């Protein structure tokens, strides 16, 4: 998985 | 059971992430260590999407 956080949902 | 639907569009930011469209169905394989990313399968391929961007359906 990506090391960075996912975007927040709207 | 691992059958889900996308709540929001998500554009792949590279690094094994998968683009998904609202309304699209996915199969979930699992989650990363903190549950923030979900590894999923759709007709467009397989990759990581935000866990919050999807939900079970049926």
Coordinates of C-alpha atoms in Angstrom, one line a residue:
Chain A
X1 CA 0.0 0.0 0.0
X2 CA 1.0 3.7 -0.4
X3 CA 3.1 5.1 2.4
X4 CA 1.3 8.4 2.4
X5 CA -2.3 8.9 3.6
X6 CA -5.2 8.7 1.2
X7 CA -7.2 11.9 0.4
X8 CA -10.1 12.6 2.8
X9 CA -13.5 11.9 1.4
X10 CA -15.6 15.0 0.5
Chain B
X1 CA -19.2 -10.1 1.7
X2 CA -16.1 -8.6 0.2
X3 CA -18.4 -7.0 -2.4
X4 CA -18.4 -3.2 -2.4
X5 CA -19.4 -0.1 -4.2
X6 CA -17.5 3.1 -4.7
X7 CA -18.9 6.2 -2.9
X8 CA -16.7 8.7 -4.7
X9 CA -14.5 9.0 -7.7
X10 CA -10.8 8.5 -7.0
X11 CA -8.1 9.2 -9.5
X12 CA -5.0 7.0 -9.1
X13 CA -2.0 8.9 -7.7
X14 CA 0.3 6.2 -8.9
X15 CA 2.2 3.8 -6.7
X16 CA -0.1 0.8 -7.1
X17 CA -3.3 2.8 -6.6
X18 CA -6.4 2.1 -8.7
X19 CA -8.8 4.7 -10.3
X20 CA -12.5 4.1 -9.3
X21 CA -15.8 5.8 -10.2
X22 CA -18.8 6.4 -7.9
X23 CA -21.2 3.5 -8.3
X24 CA -18.6 1.1 -9.5
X25 CA -18.5 -2.4 -7.9
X26 CA -15.3 -3.7 -6.3
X27 CA -14.1 -6.9 -4.6
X28 CA -12.0 -6.2 -1.5
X29 CA -8.8 -8.3 -0.9
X30 CA -7.7 -6.5 2.3
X31 CA -6.4 -3.4 3.9
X32 CA -3.0 -1.9 4.8
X33 CA -1.7 -1.8 8.4
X34 CA -3.8 1.2 9.6
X35 CA -6.9 0.4 7.6
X36 CA -6.7 3.7 5.6
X37 CA -6.0 2.0 2.3
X38 CA -7.9 -0.9 0.8
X39 CA -6.6 -3.3 -1.9
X40 CA -9.4 -3.9 -4.4
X41 CA -10.4 -5.5 -7.7
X42 CA -12.6 -3.9 -10.4
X43 CA -13.0 -4.4 -14.1
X44 CA -10.2 -1.9 -14.6
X45 CA -7.6 -3.8 -12.6
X46 CA -6.4 -4.2 -9.1
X47 CA -4.8 -1.7 -6.7
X48 CA -5.1 0.4 -3.6
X49 CA -8.0 2.8 -3.0
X50 CA -9.1 4.9 0.0
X51 CA -11.0 2.6 2.5
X52 CA -13.4 5.5 3.2
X53 CA -14.3 5.8 -0.5
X54 CA -16.0 2.4 -0.6
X55 CA -18.8 0.5 1.2
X56 CA -20.4 -2.9 1.2
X57 CA -23.4 -3.4 -1.1
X58 CA -26.3 -6.0 -0.9

